[PDB]
């Protein structure tokens, strides 16, 4: 029969969960955002569509920090993303409280994973309308991750999601091939600014605002910090230059 | 064993004039035979032309005044910024105090 796509925890005859699949549509419909793992950290970047001149520039921050060493960015329904970060925060605090050490990225990923997957188990809740790219530096290295509405997530070398996800993935694959030895914190910040600009062609209509953040063992001491002022403009230019 | 109460001394005085009123209090705060402060305000202006002092156990006095001030704030929010008459403040404070009838605010309060 039909109606398989009306309730959240229902399996369709082919084994799918249509509600999760529809949530993905809300993700693909949102802004594009990315993550670039480097030789000792990770860089996060995102497209901030400017609805009008009325939006105060640099104010509506979209990238979020969890604990002191983790960055999270997402595409889709923004409120769902915040909801997910609040949980990540409680999850991180909880882990630190009991184990003393700040939560490992792999560990943090699964906390988010199990929580999101949980929202695909009952028809009394709806799946998350966001794909989240997040990561940071821990006891043994840098880690980049992307979490889908289905609760699925994996470790990435580079990741993208949203409106211009294909452009970005394309650019990322090139970087991966042309830099087998690893990109650098400084470089990835620029490379990120570029990929966002390029990927903006799938939304070229409205003017946008760039936002980057990073977490590098050498550049930020292993803490998550936003890219501002000089280093920011420097990357914006590196992009504006290669978009021509 | 643990004693939740303490005594910070102090003395306060309230006199009702005909078209005025005063509420005084020394500024000495003590613990046993030591002075904690030579100047620790004990009488407060709570808005709507109401002054209050909760003398005795300082922690309790502070909590009570703080709770009453916040009470005045909500009075405004809930009753279209109406002013809180001194008699209405008094009745309100009674309920604040009696709410802890079994773990009293160890203070002698005057408004």
């Amino acid at each position: 029969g039909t109606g398989y796509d009306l309730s959240n925890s229902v399996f369709s005859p082919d084994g799918r969960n249509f509600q999760v699949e529809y949530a993905v549509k809300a993700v693909e419909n949102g802004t594009t955002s990315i993550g670039i793992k480097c030789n000792d950290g990770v860089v996060f970047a995102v497209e901030k569509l400017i609805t009008s001149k009325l939006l105060v520039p640099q104010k509506n921050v979209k990238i979020q920090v969890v604990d002191r060493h983790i960055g999270c960015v997402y595409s889709g329904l923004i409120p769902d993303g915040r909801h997910l970060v609040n949980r990540g925060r409680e999850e991180a605090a909880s882990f630190k409280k009991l184990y003393k050490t700040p939560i490992p990225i792999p560990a943090f990923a699964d906390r988010l994973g199990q929580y999101v997957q949980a929202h695909t188990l009952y028809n009394s809740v709806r799946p998350f309308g966001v794909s989240t790219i997040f990561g940071g530096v821990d006891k043994n290295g840098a880690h980049l991750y992307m979490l889908e509405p289905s609760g699925s997530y994996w470790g990435y070398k580079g990741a993208a999601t949203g409106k211009g996800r294909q452009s970005a993935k394309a650019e990322l694959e090139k970087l991966v091939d042309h830099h087998p030895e690893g990109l650098s914190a400084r470089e990835a910040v620029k490379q990120a600014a570029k990929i966002i600009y390029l990927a903006h062609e799938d939304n070229k209509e409205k003017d946008f605002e760039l936002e980057i953040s990073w977490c590098s063992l050498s550049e930020t001491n292993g803490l998550h910090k936003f890219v501002k002022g000089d280093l920011l403009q420097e990357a914006i230019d590196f992009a504006q230059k290669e978009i021509n | 064993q643990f004693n939740p109460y303490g005594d910070n001394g102090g003395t306060i005085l309230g006199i009702a004039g005909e078209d005025f009123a005063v509420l005084a209090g020394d500024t000495r705060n003590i613990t046993d035979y030591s002075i904690n402060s030579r100047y620790e305000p004990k009488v407060f202006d709570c808005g709507d032309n109401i002054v209050m002092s909760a003398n005795g156990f300082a922690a309790d006095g502070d909590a009570l005044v703080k709770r009453f001030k916040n009470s005045v704030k909500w009075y405004h929010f809930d009753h279209n910024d109406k002013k809180l008459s001194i008699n209405s403040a008094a009745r309100n404070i009674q309920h604040l105090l009696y709410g802890k009838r079994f773990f009293p605010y160890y203070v002698h309060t005057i408004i």
Binding site: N29, D80, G129 | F77
Partner: protein, 233 residues
């Protein structure tokens, strides 16, 4: 289509839309118009009050949250009472516990999160009201736009309600102008009353029809109604 995916908030449509939330957004549009704009020293709220009969009053559209914060509503009044009340507590909590005035940006995050919990759970319904939050904190004047979808945005100015698009184009045009109306409250208020009358059509703002509010550098959030706004009509 839609008819099969709008029976509750817990359901996504095939395109990835949340209809119950959109229907909520609609209650806003159907609401009276209100405008918000700020300089670097002040923030102003101007709203058009609507009445039922000529024998009824003009339902208020502005609510104070603390001495430094307040908002204007558009849509379901009760939901604004609930949201403003929650905001009143958060402000209160910030003062009592940390003896700190709540940052407008943070009040926005709190509102966003409260609204979001009503768009992911069964039996609950989205809030059917839009809010314009203004306030002066440790980083200056601020104006926020709150949408029932949980989306909060910081702007120099904006408007919501029926025909709101009028005032919004006006402001987007007047930007460079009003943004500098510092140290001069009356000038920002007039600039605001001009933006709102850009959404008129039915009538013209009268004395018991206009409602204005302001907060700023040395101005505790206060509301003006009737005779008090006469000097702006």
């Amino acid at each position: 289509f839609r008819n099969n995916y709008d029976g509750d908030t817990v359901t996504f449509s095939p395109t990835g839309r949340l209809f119950q939330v959109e229907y909520a957004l609609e209650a806003i549009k159907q609401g009276s118009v209100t405008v918000g704009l700020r300089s670097n020293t002040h923030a102003v709220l101007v709203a058009l009050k609507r009445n039922a009969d000529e024998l009824s009053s003009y339902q208020k559209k502005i609510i104070k949250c603390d001495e430094h914060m307040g908002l204007s509503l558009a849509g379901l009044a009760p939901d604004a009472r609930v949201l403003s009340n929650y905001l009143r507590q958060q402000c209160n909590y910030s003062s009592l516990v940390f003896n700190r005035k709540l940052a407008v940006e943070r009040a926005g995050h709190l509102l966003c999160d409260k609204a979001q919990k009503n768009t992911q759970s069964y039996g609950g319904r989205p809030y059917g009201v839009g809010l314009l939050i203004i306030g002066y904190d440790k980083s200056g004047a601020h104006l926020l736009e709150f949408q029932p979808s949980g989306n909060v945005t910081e702007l120099y100015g904006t408007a919501i309600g029926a025909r709101s698009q009028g005032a919004k184009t006006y402001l987007e045009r007047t930007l460079d102008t009003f943004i500098k109306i510092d140290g001069n409250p009356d000038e920002l208020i007039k600039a605001g009353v001009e933006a709102i009358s850009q959404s008129l059509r039915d009538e013209s703002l009268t004395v018991d029809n206009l409602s204005i509010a302001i907060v700023g550098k040395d101005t505790p959030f206060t509301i003006y109604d009737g005779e008090a706004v006469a000097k702006y009509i």
